[PDB]
Each structure stands twice: as C-alpha cells, then as structure tokens.
Design a protein around this ligand. Structure first.
Ligand SMILES: *[C@H]1O[C@H](CO)[C@@H](O)[C@H](O)[C@H]1NC(C)=O
Ligand SMILES: *[C@H]1O[C@H](CO)[C@@H](O)[C@H](O)[C@H]1NC(C)=O
Ligand SMILES: OC[C@H]1O[C@H](O)[C@H](O)[C@@H](O)[C@@H]1O
Ligand SMILES: OC[C@H]1O[C@H](O)[C@H](O)[C@@H](O)[C@@H]1O
Ligand SMILES: [Ca+2]
Ligand SMILES: [Ca+2]
Ligand SMILES: [Mn+2]
Ligand SMILES: [Mn+2]
Lengths: 47, 181, 181, 47
C-alpha cells in the first residue's frame, strides 16, 4: 500500500462557469500507452 | 438541498450517459481513452451538465468523485503523456494534445480556458514540467503548468483507485491516489 | 448502471439539465408545463438517460421519484386535461395532445411507442376514462386507457406531494398523492 | 390531510428499453388550466 496525496485551494467560483462537465482526458504523443478507466462515482451537494 | 450523484461500476459499448470525444470508447468493461498508439486524445464526459456554484446565493458545491484507473505501457521505460480528470464548461471539446493532454493549449495562464484539471503525468516536459523531471500528480488551472505538483512512481498495469474532492467552505481541492502495494 | 439520483428544489430560468419540449419553459422558481391557454402540450425531460434495466444481467432497477406539482385553473369547473410523469424511450417527442397528455395517441395497447405514465387526469374523456366521470389518477402503459385508477378530488391552486416508487423485486409501481390537510 | 394512493403490477422490463428518459407532460385542449411542477427528486438503484 503506497499512496500519494496532493492538496490546494482553488477558488472554483472565481474560475469555472455556473454549469460544468466532468470527464477524463488522456493523451499519447511521441511516446504512448493504454489509458483506461475501470469505474466511476461522483456525488455533489449544493446549499 | 440540491444534490446530484451517480456511480458506474462497469462500462459497456453502448453508454448513453457519456460523451466520447477523440479516440474515447467503452469496450465490454473498460472505458478506454487511448490504445498503446501515438499522437492520440481520449475524452469522456458525463452527459449531464453539473451545477457547481450558483449566482443567486453565491454558494459553491461540495463534491467528490472516485475512479479506478489503470495505465498500461507496453514499454516500461517508454510511456506518455498522461491521464486527466477535469471539470470544464458545458460545451467543451478537446484541446491541443499529447503532452497537453487534450485539455489545455497554452502554457501561460489562460483565463478563457474556463477549465480546471487534475493530472497524472507520465512524461517530462522541460518546457514546463517540474525541473526534477519525475512523474507527477498535479493540480492544473488554465495552463498545463500546474499550480501544485507531486512526484509519484507509476506502477504500470496497476489498478489505482483515486479520490478527488473539494471543500466548499475551505475551498480546498485535494487528491489521493493509492495502490494495493 | 447502479445509482443515479438528483434533487431539484427550485427551477431556475436556464436549466441545462432539462430538455424542454412544447410550451414547457422554466419560470423564476417553478417549471411551467402549461399556461391557462387552450390547446398546448409541454414536456420536460431529465437530460441524463437512465439505465432502468440491464440485459447484461437481467435485473431491473427500482426507483423513487418525488415532486410537487400545482394545477391552477381559472375556473374550478372547466379544467383539462391533465399532468403526468412518464418514462419513455430515450428520445420521445410530444405525442397527441389533449386527452392523450402528449404521451399517447391511442385508446389501444400499442406495444410500439413504449412508455408508461402516471397520470393525474382532470378531464373526462367519455371514450376511455373511468365512467362515473370523476377525476382520477392512473397508471398508463402503452395506452391512454389506464390499467388502473383511483378517483381523485382535485384541489385547484394547491400543492400536492406525490411519491412514486417501483419495487424492482415484484414489479409493483405505486403512486401516492398528498394535500396539506 | 387528504391522501390518495395506488399501486399495480407493471412489467417494466417487458415494456421499456434498457435506457429511458423520465419526465413530465401536461396538456390542454378546449378546457385548459395551468400546470406547474415545483420541485423534483429522483433516485434509482440498479444492483
Ligand atoms: C470541509 O469538511 C469538513 C467536514 O466536517 C469540515 O470540518 C471543514 O469545514 C472542511 N474541511 C476541509 C476538507 O477543508
Ligand atoms: C421490494 O424489496 C423488498 C426487500 O425485502 C421487499 O420486502 C419490498 O416489497 C420492496 N422494498 C424495496 C427494496 O424497495
Ligand atoms: O509524449 C512525449 C511528447 O510527445 C510529443 O512529442 C508531444 O509533442 C509532446 O507534447 C509530448 O510531451
Ligand atoms: O380539453 C378538453 C377536450 O378538448 C377536445 O375535445 C380534445 O379533443 C380533448 O383531447 C380534450 O379532452
Ligand atoms: Ca507531461
Ligand atoms: Ca382524461
Ligand atoms: Mn506535468
Ligand atoms: Mn384518465
């Protein structure tokens, strides 16, 4: 069990539009690899 | 209280709730964005637009996503360019690719890129990647030069569950990747 | 595939997550499907497709929906035609209006156009509605002729909680309606 | 606290596609009236 974790404030209201999309974006270039995702959950709340 | 969630344990070819873009497709189980092949771009978005803040009250949303993802490079020493989770305007489509991860263009702060991403970065770009050149997790906002960075050792072909979440009160993002070993 | 939910406490002028058709537009707080005005239809559909059942496994989901709606008619006598929550194939359009509530076109079991609806019927159509001609709520399946109904006293201008659930293990669909009283 | 209630057997699987859409319709003909929806939750579990 090794694990990495990064953290940071980022003032989303300042930066992104009222409504979003999420997804993944993955790319090869000169060198390359398989980039695949096995499963996905997502929850959000809004008071 | 306005809330919205989903969860997808498994994928399948026909998946009406996702929007593939570039090479993106679902096999019978994997959601695969790039095959081991050069100069490509995979993008999946959740069909449904998401409300993250609202300008009547001004509040921002607490949220969390979670996904297990495997990067598999048929070379051990030779892998790029990355994988990325990112939130974006409703109608976003792909951007400059390879080491831009099909999501950003410029390398300087671009405001008009209304979009934030979290990257797992399998290749060193001396143009902007951390000088030490180690593979890194990073928080990107409007340029591929990350606001923050974190060395991480890729385990190839390894299932790596990850959580990313954002505190609306403290307004902090944060990421966690984990391997079984 | 497993778990989709949302909740929407107010409707806001633009709703990127809702597909309107017909006269359906969202006012400041409400969603108006219809104006006190002859001969219209209005339909609003959750944007996200939703996987109700899976051939892969064979299991049907069970789900629970909840809304408040209001029916506000100028004259408590001459009102029509009704309101209706429906589950339809992924890209329905308004069906025949009036009596058919934009969901059906026939008094006849029409396997083809493949939708089920819970109908809060407020106008006697001598041709198919229950005949004592009392208003009623009904479960409709491939027909505008409900496989079943309760008679139901309307309360103009007043809010109704309605809860609908389907238990997937017995295919029982149940609707409940409530007034403050 | 007048309440109405109603349930019934509906072979959903045999009636409806693997993937659907939910929604409301309201309608007027000769006689009319306003139809508004105020708030709406939905939750589905497919285990
Ligand atoms: C957000 O969540 C916790 C939950 O209690 C709270 O104590 C605090 O305000 C926030 N903390 C973070 C993650 O910054
Ligand atoms: C359908 O399933 C349960 C489980 O025991 C059954 O007892 C009841 O009729 C329904 N309840 C659920 C799961 O909503
Ligand atoms: O994959 C390594 C490199 O591939 C290509 O050279 C791309 O131009 C570059 O963006 C990427 O970093
Ligand atoms: O609106 C009252 C009635 O008007 C017309 O007769 C329409 O044919 C019918 O659909 C509706 O029920
Ligand atoms: Ca890189
Ligand atoms: Ca009727
Ligand atoms: Mn980088
Ligand atoms: Mn009827």
């Amino acid at each position: 069990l090794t694990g990495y974790t990064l953290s940071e404030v980022v003032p989303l209201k300042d930066v992104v539009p009222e409504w979003v999309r999420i997804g993944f974006s993955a790319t090869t270039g000169a060198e390359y690899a398989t980039h695949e995702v096995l499963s996905w959950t997502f929850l959000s709340e809004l008071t | 209280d306005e809330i919205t969630s989903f969860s997808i344990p498994k994928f399948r070819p026909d998946q009406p709730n996702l929007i593939f873009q570039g090479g993106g497709y679902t096999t019978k189980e994997k959601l695969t964005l790039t095959k081991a092949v050069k100069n490509t771009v995979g993008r999946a978005l959740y069909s449904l637009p998401i409300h993250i803040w609202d300008s009547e009250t001004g509040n921002v949303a607490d949220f969390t996503t979670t996904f297990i993802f495997v990067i598999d490079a048929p070379n051990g020493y030779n892998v790029a360019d990355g994988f990325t989770f990112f939130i974006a305007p409703v109608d976003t489509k792909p951007q400059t690719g390879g080491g831009y991860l099909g999501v950003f263009n410029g390398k300087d702060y671009d405001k008009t890129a209304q979009t934030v991403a979290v990257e797992f970065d399998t290749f060193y770009n001396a143009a902007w990647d951390p000088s030490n050149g180690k593979r890194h997790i990073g928080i990107d906002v409007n340029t591929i030069k990350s606001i923050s960075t974190k060395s991480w050792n890729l385990q190839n072909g390894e299932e790596a569950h990850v959580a990313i979440s954002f505190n609306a009160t403290t307004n902090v993002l944060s990421v966690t990747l984990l391997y079984p070993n």
